[PDB]
Amino acid sequence: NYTFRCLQMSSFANRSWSRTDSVVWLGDLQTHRWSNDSATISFTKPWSQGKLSNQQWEKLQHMFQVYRVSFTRDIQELVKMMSPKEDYPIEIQLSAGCEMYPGNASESFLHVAFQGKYVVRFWGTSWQTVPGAPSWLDLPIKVLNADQGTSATVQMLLNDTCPLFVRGLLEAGKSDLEKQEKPVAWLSSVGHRQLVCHVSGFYPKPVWVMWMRGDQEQQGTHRGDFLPNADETWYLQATLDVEAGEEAGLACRVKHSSLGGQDIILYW
Amino acid sequence: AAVTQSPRNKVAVTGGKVTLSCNQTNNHNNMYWYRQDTGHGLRLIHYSYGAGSTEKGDIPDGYKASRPSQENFSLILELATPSQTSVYFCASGDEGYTQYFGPGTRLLVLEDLRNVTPPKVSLFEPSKAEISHTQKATLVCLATGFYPDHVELSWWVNGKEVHSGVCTDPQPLKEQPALNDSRYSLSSRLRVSATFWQNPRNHFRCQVQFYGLSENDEWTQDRAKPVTQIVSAEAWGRA
Amino acid sequence: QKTPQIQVYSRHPPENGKPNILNCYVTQFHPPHIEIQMLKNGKKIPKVEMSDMSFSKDWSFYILAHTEFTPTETDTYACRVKHASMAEPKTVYWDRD
Amino acid sequence: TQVEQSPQSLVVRQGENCVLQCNYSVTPDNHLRWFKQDTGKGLVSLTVLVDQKDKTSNGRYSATLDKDAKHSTLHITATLLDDTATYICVVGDRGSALGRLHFGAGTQLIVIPDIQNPDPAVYQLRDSKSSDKSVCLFTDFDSQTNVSQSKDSDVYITDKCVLDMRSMDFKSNSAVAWSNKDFACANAFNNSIIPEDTFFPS
Ligand SMILES: CCCCCCCCCCCCCC[C@@H](O)[C@@H](O)[C@H](CO[C@H]1O[C@H](CO)[C@H](O)[C@H](O)[C@H]1O)NC(=O)CCCCCCC
Ligand SMILES: *[C@@H]1O[C@H](CO[C@@H]2O[C@@H](C)[C@@H](O)[C@@H](O)[C@@H]2O)[C@@H](O[C@@H]2O[C@H](CO)[C@@H](O)[C@H](O)[C@H]2NC(C)=O)[C@H](O)[C@H]1NC(C)=O
Ligand SMILES: CCCCCCCCCCCCCCCC(=O)O
Ligand SMILES: *[C@@H]1O[C@H](CO)[C@@H](O)[C@H](O)[C@H]1NC(C)=O
Ligand SMILES: *[C@@H]1O[C@H](CO)[C@@H](O)[C@H](O)[C@H]1NC(C)=O
Secondary structure, three states, rough: OOOEEEEEEEEEEEOEEEEEEEEEEEEOOEEEEOOOOOOOOOEEOOOOOOOHHHHHHHHHHHHHHHHHHHHHHHHHHHHHHHHOOOOOOOOEEEEEEEEEEEOEEEEEEEHHHHHHEEEEEEEOOOEEEOOOOOOHHHHHHHHHHHOHHHHEEEEEEEEHHHHHHHHEEEEEEHHOOOOOOOEEEEEOOOOOOOEEEEEEEEEEOOOEEEEEEEOOOOOEEOOOOOOOOOOOOOOEEEEEEEOOOOOOEEEEEOOOHHHOOOOEEEEO | OOEEEOEEEEEEEEEOOEEEEEEOOOOOOEEEEEEEOOOOOOOEEEOOOOOOOOOOOOOOOOEEEOOOOOOOOOEOOOOOOOOHEEEEEEEEEEOOOOEEEOOOOOEEEEEOOOOOOOOOOEEEOHHHHHHHHHHHEEEEEEEEEOOOEEEEEEEEEEEEEEOOOOOEEEOOOEEOOOOOOOEEEEEEEEEEEEHHHHHHEEEEEEEEEEEOOOOOOOOOOOOOOOOOOEEEEEEEEEO | EEOOOOEEEEOOOOOOOOOEEEEEEEEEEEOOOOOOEEEOOEEEOOOOEEEEEOOOOOOOOOEEEEEEEEOOOOOOOOEEEOOOOOOOOEEEEEOOO | OEEEOOOEEEEEEEOOOOOOOEOOOOOOOEEEEEEOOOOOOOEEEEEEEOEEEEEEEEEOOEEEEEEOOOOEEEEEOOOOOOEEEEEEEEEEEEOOOOOEEEEEOOOOEEEEOOOOOOOOEEEEEOOOOOOOEEEEEEOOOOOOOOOOOOOOOOEEEOOOEEEEHHHHHEEEEEEEEEEOOOOOOHHHOOOOOOOOOOOOOO
């Protein structure tokens, strides 16, 4: 049950300087990137083209190439239309794609953020502001919705191209997507004292980490955030707060799908 | 969706302040100023997204813009130059792509106004032989002795402008093709039916709208100040 | 403008003498213009690899710096972060654990 | 110059068709518009093409647009005299007010009128306010006659000019000649190759 995401981030420093950079995710694996520096969209996987032919991908990339230049001018021109209401620096962010469900089902989304706040989306056959959005965006919205050609393209991108493409990706990237890498663990410590069970190298994201005395799961164990490694595996740590000289017979048990029922138990 | 431009035609001196204005009652947020020079397309000078906004176009140098209100977008040439001789077009629009254009403003920027001079207009009455040979009568109007070439010749019958049966020289000819600042002449014809000319109640008139100096242009010479003005010539029909 | 959270951690379990990779995860900041250095004993480590910048559901940015390192008894490692939100640069040290 | 037109100029006889190219490199290309501009007047819209492959019509004007080739044509069927004008190609790069319009330099059309029944003559017309000055009007000659400017520079001869008496469906060429400096209408157009059947009255 996977979500495809096209994260775009655009900084407009002043009247004449901007950059637009994109990264693309399928679940928690990167499939593409597009640096401002580059004329073309980069694959970060062997299967990033999906099941699209070369001719289909070139036409798709060319649409984006025209979009990026066109997007840059439009923002610049929308700032002029609104000024002095809003001025630079400005940060535009888009989050777009589709979440895939079993059978043939999917929802597509295209959400826009202005200075870090979600304000606009494409919905149905038009742009609209979401709740909380400042009412001055109604002029930008009226202007964007005048562009009939863009509406029809975006509707085709959201309704048809996204789900079709992502069906292709999941077929093409099944083995990378369904990969199983094993966690490795280690222990450590730092008037109280805090024990730390480190777990690292595991894929996919789901994992269980408890501190234990025998069978007694120490309901007290604080779970950290999922931090990434550079090789598309995950890192997590669980801390437990204890009295000094009370570390005897404490263990860290971790369960994970790659271990095949054979849990890692480390004893202090 | 109508757009108006004033003035329609201006003769100005280097160093002068010229102000081309454009009024628009459509409540369009957006307005645009272009200039058209032979061998180019229209090129964008300045534009506006609303009262208070002015934006630089592709060729803004030489021009200031001014949007005092939703109705008026004014183009200001602070220190005029001969290079700004052009035909200037204004346009307006709402959020859509259509730009609704104005009728155009012709500007000529001279080095000096010393030779500026209005036309003498003469109306010439149809030949008695033409009437009998063709059953048609051709009046001829003749604007002469004028400079520069910014004239508009129009024909009027009983106080109403006529275009049917007219044609005016595509450009005026030079009276002294040697001399650098030669005065011009311009001819025009109005051909009508012999019985129309023979009706003594039809009043014919050739009018030349000459464009020259303003009230505010300084005049150093003895002769009459060659102001923007109308000269006409006039005749009635006869059996 | 929000203050960036920095977290330094090793890929593999840290054994002295053994080659390893040191990660620095910088998160929850905006705007995205940021300067990230990985330090060894205060000196700037050369050829630090950087991930592409990205963001979370709350639109806050994040990025992963990493570099090869072999930990030792004596050597200190850090991640140094300059960003408009902070008056001074912020250094967080590797916990060795 | 992102918008180029061909031909730069062309001359056709009344009733003939003609075709006008416009090629462009503007990106993107939302829509293409064709303007008609009369000498002196301003911009009259003829048609606007919007689709990837599009076709439009407007009476005797028809037009195509192919956005892959980035190319458009304007067909005029059965030219009339009023078509004498500059024709201007314009590409808008957005489907909204955020667009810039990129203008072609024009194609100059001239339509030569079909003079049905020539009756070439040279008449003398007198001034209403002062009947000792006059002009000489060479008129009613077909479009295959050329009118040359004079030998003496004190004599003035304007170039030919067609007028259209609309209620009668009647066109006629004309040229005017005059001089203060022993000037007569029989001698006025000596320097032009005029027909032998030209009528010199009285
Ligand atoms: C301070 C103001 C805040 C602004 C907030 C607005 C947020 C909306 C941002 C996204 C808008 C899309 C930008 C480009 C668009 O305006 C238009 O200029 C171009 C170019 O449009 C022009 O050319 C095309 C031909 O390619 C059409 O002819 C169109 O009619 C024309 O306008 N459209 C396309 O390329 C389709 C791109 C769809 C991108 C979806 C993003 C994942
Ligand atoms: C494309 O689909 C929309 C409706 O789908 C929603 O919006 C998409 C962009 C995407 O986010 C989906 O996941 C959403 O479920 C169609 O919009 C409807 O259009 C009809 C008539 O055209 C109109 O009466 C309805 O109001 C629209 N529905 C909604 C919910 O707004 C749209 O027509 C589709 N377009 C194409 C070209 O396929
Ligand atoms: C954006 C929704 C449509 C999804 C279909 C596009 C599939 C191609 C994925 C690679 C495109 C990368 C371009 C990102 C463009 C951007 O957001 O700036
Ligand atoms: C725009 O901002 C950049 C830095 O973000 C700076 O280098 C440049 O001076 C600015 N440009 C202008 C025209 O002021
Ligand atoms: C981003 O790309 C555009 C077009 O390739 C370029 O004009 C611009 O200068 C680039 N900006 C930066 C900051 O690199």
